[PDB]
Design a protein around this ligand. Structure first.
Ligand code: ATP
Ligand SMILES: *[C@H]1O[C@H](CO)[C@@H](O[C@@H]2O[C@H](CO)[C@@H](O)[C@H](O)[C@H]2NC(C)=O)[C@H](O)[C@H]1NC(C)=O
Lengths: 335, 100, 49, 49
């Protein structure tokens, strides 16, 4: 029914459970990290909401302050023209209602400061509120500028866009069985100091009676000097010679079908455009390896400059290859 | 080298002596050019273009919101209240000029 | 939308049935409408969700 | 001598009798949409994708 889960989902993203892990809690440093790593559609909202909430809260406080000293009480009962109102101990000149106090805030924090709303030195509460408002304004402004810049700075990179071939091919090369998959690129900047690795993961025993349900057994990529590094500007076929020292020796096409196995391919390198390390992975399951289907050439010969294609990436022409074992392959090389 | 003269195109030059990857990709699955792409081009401009886009952006924002403010000070019956030269500004105090 | 408001006002006054200024405005409205049509058509025609 | 957005005849901008029922406001609002289009367009077409 449900097949045993691949130690690696096709696109990557190792899907393994994690049970009975002691909680590490949380920290407000984590909330900040969540903030920095947002996406625009929510940054340009949390930012605006912080600003608007800040202004409204301080405006409410301003209204209370202008209430206690009775600023509103003096202003409203005004006689014809103006004799009583102007000269008395108002605390913040020309604040007489909420909307007015709101405007006073928006003139203080964002640093507009027109001048119709002046503040005097007669109410210590007013001086402490002004200091507090200004400090809060600077801190909020600094952190929001930091966040916006961090996005403008680290948006030089994009989602990992690396494409492996869909399938894998067990083929014949140099008169021997061989393993092949295709690794290409759609990105712009050539990966720098790229490396490729291949790991076979299958349940194994140990003759002293011990099992290890998901082993990992690195396996050698063929190369004339055995160097894991690889240049890539056109799609390539990362090969794999097979020998009696390699963990795939005991498989023929007949036994392939109902076999527990896998291959994980992980390759890593540093993109130079973004100057940042990255690694991409794939994983082929037993049923996904089309035997004998030798790969189809891509690079052609146009007049001035070579050319490649991508519509026919996984075209698998089929050729005759022995339908037999690998041990038996060297047991009977007669014909 | 007349054969090479007519063979100027036939040439095994995978990478040009400059260093680029002289190649040709085609038949690819171009999903599109999503919005954020333009912003990245903003980062990698040169000084003359960056300065121009900078100044143009500031001036465009200023002019646009100035036009908006002009409409606002129009609709509230403010420009007329000022234009009434019965006095220096006879009834311009009570009418609550929306923006002084 | 701005043109439609202008046309209704251009309406009530009824300066003329064919008083020239009313005639023009009307022409501008219809082309605008045709352009709205293309925008909707292009949305469906190319990628739309 | 001052330039007049709505003409210089005194108090011809006396916008009583309905907010939008004036001989000049319609034009101004139509100009606002056109100005908005030009400003946004210039900024996104002076960089390019
Ligand atoms: N021309 C191409 N453009 C983009 N991606 C390609 C192209 N050719 C191959 N690929 C990538 O290689 C992988 C295997 O592709 P393959 O040749 O099997 O096509 P497919 O998987 O049969 O069809 P599809 O790619 O539509 O699923 C795909 O995941 C794809 O992302
Ligand atoms: C500004 O001046 C004009 C005149 O140039 C005025 O319009 C007319 O003026 C007459 C008086 O000469 C008034 O009766 C009316 O206001 C208009 N004509 C009529 C109705 O007979 C008006 O004061 C202003 N302009 C407008 C909007 O007409």
């Amino acid at each position: 029914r449900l097949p045993k889960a691949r130690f690696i989902a096709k696109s990557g993203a190792c899907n393994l459970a994690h049970k009975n892990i002691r909680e590490q809690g949380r920290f407000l440093q984590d909330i900040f990290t969540t903030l920095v790593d947002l996406k625009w559609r929510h940054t340009l909202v949390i930012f605006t909401m912080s600003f608007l909430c800040s202004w409204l809260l301080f405006a409410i406080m301003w209204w209370l302050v202008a209430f206690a000293h009775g600023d509103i009480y003096a202003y409203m009962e005004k006689g014809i023209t103006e004799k009583s109102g102007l000269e008395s101990a108002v605390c913040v000149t020309n604040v007489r209602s909420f909307t007015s106090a709101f405007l006073f805030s928006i003139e203080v924090q964002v640093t507009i400061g027109f001048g119709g709303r002046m503040m005097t030195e007669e109410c210590p509460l007013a001086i402490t509120v002004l200091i507090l408002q200004n400090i809060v304004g600077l801190i909020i402004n600094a952190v929001m500028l930091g966040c916006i810049f961090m996005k403008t700075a680290q948006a030089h990179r994009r989602a990992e866009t690396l494409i492996f071939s869909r399938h894998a091919v067990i083929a014949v090369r140099n008169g021997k069985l061989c393993f092949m998959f295709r690794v290409g690129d759609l990105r712009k900047s050539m990966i720098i100091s790229a490396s490729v690795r291949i790991q076979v993961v299958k349940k194994t025993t140990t003759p002293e009676g011990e099992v290890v349900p998901i082993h990992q057994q690195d396996i050698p990529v063929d190369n004339p000097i055995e160097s894991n590094n690889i240049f890539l500007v056109a799609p390539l076929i990362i090969c794999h010679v097979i020998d009696k020292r390699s963990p795939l020796y005991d498989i023929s096409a007949t036994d392939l079908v109902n076999q527990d196995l896998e291959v994980i391919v992980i390759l890593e390198g540093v993109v130079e455009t973004t100057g940042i390390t990255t690694q991409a992975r794939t994983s082929y399951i037993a049923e996904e390896i089309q035997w004998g289907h030798r790969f189809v050439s891509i690079v052609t010969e146009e007049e001035g400059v070579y050319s490649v294609d991508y519509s026919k990436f996984g075209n698998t022409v089929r050729v005759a290859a022995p339908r037999c074992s690998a041990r038996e392959l060297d047991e009977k090389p007669s014909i | 080298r007349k054969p090479r003269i007519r063979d100027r195109l036939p040439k095994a030059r995978f990478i040009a002596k400059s260093g680029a990857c002289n190649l040709a990709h085609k038949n690819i699955r171009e999903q599109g050019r999503f919005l954020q792409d333009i912003f990245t081009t903003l980062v990698d401009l040169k000084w003359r273009h960056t300065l121009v886009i900078f100044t143009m952006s500031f001036l465009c924002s200023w002019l646009l919101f100035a036009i908006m403010w002009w409409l606002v000070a129009f609709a509230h019956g403010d420009i007329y209240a000022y234009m009434e030269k019965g006095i220096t500004e006879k009834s311009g105090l009570e009418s609550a000029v929306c923006v002084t | 939308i701005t043109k439609t408001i202008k046309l209704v006002k251009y309406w009530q006054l009824g300066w003329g049935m064919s008083d020239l200024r009313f005639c023009i405005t009307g022409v501008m409205v219809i082309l605008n409408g045709l352009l709205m049509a293309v925008e909707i058509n292009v949305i469906r025609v190319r990628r739309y969700v | 001598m001052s330039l007049s957005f709505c003409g210089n005849n005194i108090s011809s901008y006396n916008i009583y009798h309905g907010v939008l029922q004036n001989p000049c406001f319609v034009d101004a609002l139509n100009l606002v949409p056109h100005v908005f289009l030009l400003f946004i367009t210039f900024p996104i077409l002076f960089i390019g994708w």
